């Protein structure tokens, strides 16, 4: 539901109405602790599926645009492939 | 699966109708890279659920008891809680 308080409306190409979800591509297990830290810090939480190849990817459950933006921008810092949903 | 040349099935806690699954309790994110390696090495593979508190746990996919036995003892080496299915 809507928890209020947090409002975000920064100038940029910030499109209205999305799912506010981010899915990543399979990345190396050693980056996992730090990305979990981001999700925890951004209070997003995600399910990290380990693939048999020895890589994992997370799917982050819906949050706000402000938390969303920072999380995807993080994956962008890592140069990882991701999906904004 | 049926891949042949795999003689690795040393005795373990052989309980009837076991699922051969091990789920852990919420543990620290920095140990996640190591445990993901263990799963990948022990050919188990798992889903790591991150909690909002900043801890994660894995649910491992069914494997042989000889593989999982070492994995559960690994969790014990770490002093983490787990369940053997």
Pick A36's closest partner by Cβ from B39, B46, B56: B56
Residue ranges of the alpha helices (H) in B1-85?
32-41, 65-77
CB-CB under 8 Å, A40 with B29: yes
Measured CA to CA, the distance from residue B18 to residue A58 in angstroms comes to: 29
Distance from CA of A57 to the nearest CA of B (A): 10
Range of the domain at A4: 1-85
Residue B59 at interface with chain A, using a CB cutoff of 8 Å: no
Opening angle at CA B70, ends A49 and B62, nearest 5:
45
- Which domain CATH number covers A79? 3.30.70.2030
Q: What's the structural domain count of chain A?
A: 1
Strand partners, B23: B59, B83
* B60 and B46 Cβ atoms separated by less than 8 Å: yes
From the list A36, A49, A50, the residue facing B29 with the nearest CB is A36
- In sequence order, which residues have a C-beta less than 8 Å from that of residue A10 and are 6 or more positions away? A69
- Give the long-range contacts of residues B34-38, CB within 8 A, separation 24 or more: B35/B74, B35/B78, B36/A29, B36/A32, B36/A50, B36/A54, B36/A56, B37/A29, B37/A54, B38/B71, B38/B74
> Mutate which of A3, A26, A29, A39 to test chain B, going by most B C-beta atoms within 10 A?
A29
Nearest to B37 among A29, A33, A46 (CB): A29
Query: Which residues in A lie closer than 8 A to residue B46 (C-beta atoms)?
Result: 50
């Amino acid at each position: 539901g809507s928890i209020q308080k947090v409002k975000n409306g920064n100038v940029a190409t910030t499109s209205p109405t999305k799912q506010n979800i981010i899915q990543s591509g399979a990345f190396s297990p050693y980056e996992t602790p730090d990305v979990m830290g981001a999700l925890t810090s951004l209070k997003m939480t995600a399910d990290f599926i380990l693939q048999s190849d020895g890589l994992t990817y997370f799917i982050s459950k819906p949050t706000s645009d402000a938390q969303l933006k920072a999380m995807k921008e993080y994956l962008d810092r890592k140069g990882w492939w991701y999906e904004v949903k």
